[PDB]
């Protein structure tokens, strides 16, 4: 009786002076919008139904129509920016925020979902949602002694919505908004539902993607340990965002980086650096490059965990992108590491795989590598081993590639090449 209705019929009824007729019509709208494929969002919008739906949200006396219209608006906002804008333009935000206090959980759940889709669109709406005061009503929904007493799906919806209020960067969420949210976030990050866990990590990964002051307010809550732990999770949906947070945190101050190391992060990398899911491998190597780009005692930490061998491996065989992250990890290592350390690196077999990479069709990596070689020679120059090093690079045909690059087009390249040639060979 509310299945497959035509847009005009939905209009016909929503316009009647019959509450019940409207309810039936609003529900029919919901079903159209909740259909498997091609929900007639633009058709419903053109019919001018949003204002009507928004107004139904406030019909306290008829919770049923509140729900239906909520669900309907929710799906419209789930669309394009263009469409989401329509919902916002209709006054949906304040109304949805009002529903968070509803006595009907499935209704405030919808409101949660709805606000989730709106802040999702981006910075602008994200901040408008905050300005209408959504954060408190939301957080209030989690003010319970034990998160597990809440309906699983309901808890997931809130988590997801909260994560969206942490998302986007130009600009980043308002500092006080982040400060306000973080506490609940930390608590959610210790829940047993993999879903909640994944989105909790995403939220954190978002907050840690920015300036050091941002990273700090996160690290300041002492969640790094928990992240390192989730970093070891067996579910890829959790591991991915966790590795993102850790990877971001290590782009900050060395003190912040130290935190993840102290947390045991490194012990998981042998696994991560050989992980089957290509992308996890790229993130892992990228993270490693931001660790090798730090304090020597930190580089040493990498060395003690036997991660160099893995870096050699990654450099030797992996997706090119992962190799590019490896190139950096290496170059950064040789850029700030001790002599003894730059030596160990060569002893692990860094030279061959590193040379083979010079054949890569990418001027940028070619620089990072020559750059890296430079650093290595200089360490070998301090041990009068420059010649011996030359042989190696010559043994695996590296020199045969440096003189070729010498005749490369990019300036940075041919120049770096020549220097090496004359200064360390011919």
């Amino acid at each position: 009786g509310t299945v497959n209705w035509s847009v005009e019929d939905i209009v016909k009824g929503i316009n009647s002076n019959n509450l019940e007729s409207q309810l039936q019509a609003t529900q029919a709208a919901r079903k159209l919008l909740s259909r498997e494929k091609q929900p007639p969002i633009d058709n419903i919008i053109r019919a001018g139904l949003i204002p009507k739906f928004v107004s139904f949200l406030g019909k306290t006396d008829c919770s049923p129509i509140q729900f239906e219209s909520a669900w309907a608006l929710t799906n419209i906002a789930s669309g394009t920016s263009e469409q989401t804008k329509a919902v916002v333009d209709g006054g949906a935000i304040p109304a949805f925020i009002s529903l968070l206090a509803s006595p009907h959980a499935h209704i405030s759940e919808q409101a949660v979902w709805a606000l989730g889709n709106i802040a999702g669109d981006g910075s602008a709406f994200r901040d408008l949602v905050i300005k209408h005061g959504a954060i408190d009503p939301l957080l209030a929904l989690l003010a319970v002694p034990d998160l597990s007493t809440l309906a699983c799906g309901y808890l997931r919806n809130l988590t997801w919505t909260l994560s969206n209020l942490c998302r986007n960067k130009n600009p980043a969420p308002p500092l006080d908004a982040v400060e306000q949210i973080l506490p609940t976030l930390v608590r959610l990050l210790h829940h047993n539902d993999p879903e909640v866990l994944a989105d909790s990590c995403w939220a954190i990964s978002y907050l840690t993607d920015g300036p050091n002051e941002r990273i700090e307010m996160v690290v300041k809550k002492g969640v790094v340990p928990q992240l390192v732990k989730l970093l070891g999770a067996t579910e890829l949906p959790i591991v991915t965002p966790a590795l993102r947070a850790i990877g971001n945190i290590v782009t900050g101050t060395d003190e912040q980086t130290q935190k993840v190391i102290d947390a045991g992060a490194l012990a998981v990398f042998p696994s991560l650096l050989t992980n089957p899911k290509t992308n996890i491998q790229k993130e892992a190597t990228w993270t490693m490059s931001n660790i090798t780009a730090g304090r020597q005692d930190q580089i040493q930490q990498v060395v003690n965990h036997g991660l160099v061998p893995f870096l050699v491996g990654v450099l030797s065989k992996a997706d090119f992108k992962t190799q590019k992250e490896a190139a950096w990890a290496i170059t950064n290592y040789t850029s700030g590491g001790t002599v003894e350390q730059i030596v160990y690196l060569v002893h692990c077999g860094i030279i061959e795989p590193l040379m083979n990479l010079l054949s890569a069709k990418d001027t940028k990596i070619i620089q990072v590598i020559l750059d890296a070689i430079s650093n290595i020679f200089q360490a070998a120059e301090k041990l009068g081993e420059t010649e011996k090093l030359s042989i190696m690079i010559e043994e695996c045909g590296g020199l045969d590639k440096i003189e070729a690059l010498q005749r490369h087009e990019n300036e940075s390249v041919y120049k770096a090449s020549l220097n090496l040639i004359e200064k360390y060979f011919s």
Binding site: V250, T251, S289, A293
Partner: peptide
């Protein structure tokens, strides 16, 4: 800053 935010 050797730390690059490939973001």
């Amino acid at each position: 800053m050797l730390k690059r935010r490939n973001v």
